[PDB]
């Protein structure tokens, strides 16, 4: 869930109070065989309104990956998960597909998992 | 303005479509589509033996004219009085299109 | 009268610019069409949907004599980014290893 | 007394060919189509 | 002696629906919708 | 009256000219409309408000 | 000063300039441009926490 990293108590009150995220990246520190890519969904599970395509990302290397070509910050188009209010109560999904079965081992070999998550403060 | 290409071709619709707006500026003619019925009417008289085809190709010529100015002049002339003609009764476009 | 006639913008020199103008027009509409069925084409790759229609013909309507064929070409134009504009969507990425 | 009046006639419209595929992306030959169109307009203009 | 005068009736206005949303930042749709309402403008100069 | 009736810009020519850029116009409102309210919607989010 | 241009936030800390990305061809103004050298205020840093 979103709302429970209590991301809004890392600052002071004062600052701004409009917090909405800007990117999120992800990274996965397990043993990854040669030749072999990682297959992972994250997912948005929230209520509120978005554009077309900009609710999901997918993970292939899993090396501070952002699910894109390359990333540029001043793209004319929004970024995934762009203005999701950081006291929202949804809950960011990430789901391991075909992991019981092929991915087995890469997720016995799995560590845990790391968000970075860059938002704006107004 | 033109091509030996449309010359040799033998949709002769397409190449009064191509020739009609230079008859009409020299004719003074209202638009050109009285001069591509012009046009139309003179290729049926075919005046000196010259179809469309054969005037364009007569213009598409450096100049290589031993007695072909006579048909290119007589096209002209019978174009010219076609057309003063259709002027004089103040013919109407979808009458002479008709 | 004999002022009028003597004129720089006589009857000839209005004749003989429509003519020209008239032209280039024809040829000009021609290349515009194309331009506007390629643009098309790459839209409907694009979208990956060949059904889409937007160019349907008849902007040169004779009843008009081919005049504001433009205004239609633009209309169709602003159809086609509207369309654009409304179905695109930002794809996810995959890469994979062979 | 004598009169007159006009007379129209049937009158018919251009057709469409098959398209071809260009290199470019959508939005670059949109611009280009647009400015050939803008000066197709200016001539039409002229004309009238 | 005759007269004439002109009359006039009631008439409306258009009306507004709910928006949709796009991809591009703001100011890419700003110039994009300030290109077609030039052309609009144009267009109803020439119907003028 | 007779070279005026049959004169290349006459009445049907205006008037089908005329007709047609009404249409067009028409469509182009509809269209133009759309483009603003767009707009007006990304201008809504990006201020948030 | 412009609206945002008086304060940066710190996250990482190596050589950090509180930006994604710094662009010195920005059409932007940057943080704390246009400050006089010269002036009487002060810079605050703040840990909180």
């Keep these: ?122 | ?98 | 009268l004999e002022l009028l006639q003597r004129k720089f913008t006589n009857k000839a020199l209005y004749s003989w610019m429509r003519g020209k103008l008239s032209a280039i027009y024809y040829q000009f509409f021609d290349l515009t069409q194309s331009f506007c069925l390629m643009a098309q084409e790459a839209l409907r790759r694009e979208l990956t949907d060949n059904g889409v229609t937007f160019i349907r013909g008849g902007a040169w309507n004779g009843t008009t004599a081919g005049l504001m064929a433009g205004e239609t070409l633009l209309l169709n134009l602003a159809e086609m980014e509207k369309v654009w504009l409304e179905r695109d969507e930002r794809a996810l990425e995959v890469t994979r290893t062979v | 007394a004598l009169l007159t009046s006009m007379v129209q006639a049937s009158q018919g419209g251009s057709a469409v060919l098959p398209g071809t595929l260009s290199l470019y992306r959508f939005p670059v030959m949109l611009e280009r189509t647009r400015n050939l169109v803008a000066q197709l307009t200016q001539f039409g203009t002229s004309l009238l």
């Excluded at chain 1, 899993?62 to 995934?80: E, I, K, W």
């Excluded at chain 2, 500026?25 to 075919?46: F, G, K, Q």
């Excluded at chain 2, 005037?55 to 072909?68: P, Q």
């Design chain 1, 1 to 122: 869930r979103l709302s429970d990293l209590k991301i809004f108590s890392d600052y002071p009150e004062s600052l701004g109070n409009t917090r909405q995220l800007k990117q999120v990246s992800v990274t996965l520190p397990a043993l990854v065989g040669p030749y072999e890519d990682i297959r992972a969904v994250l997912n948005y599970g929230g209520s509120i309104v978005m554009p077309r395509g900009c609710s999901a990302i997918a993970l292939s290397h899993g090396v501070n990956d952002s699910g894109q070509f390359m990333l540029d910050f001043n793209d004319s188009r929004y970024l995934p998960f762009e203005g999701i209010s950081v006291n929202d109560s949804g809950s960011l999904t990430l789901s391991f597909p075909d992991a019981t079965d092929r991915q087995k081992a890469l997720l016995e070999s799995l560590s845990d998992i790391i968000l970075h998550i860059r938002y704006t403060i107004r």
């Design chain 2, 1 to 98: 303005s033109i091509s030996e290409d449309m010359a040799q071709s033998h949709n002769r619709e397409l190449q009064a479509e191509i020739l009609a707006p230079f008859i009409a500026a020299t004719l003074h003619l209202a638009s050109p589509d009285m001069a591509r019925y012009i046009l139309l009417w003179t290729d049926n008289l075919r005046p000196g033996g010259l179809d469309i085809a054969g005037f364009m190709t007569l213009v598409l010529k450096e100049s290589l004219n031993a007695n072909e100015t006579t048909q290119l002049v007589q096209f002209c002339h019978v174009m010219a009085q076609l057309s003063l003609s259709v002027q004089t009764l103040r013919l109407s476009e979808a009458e002479l299109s008709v």
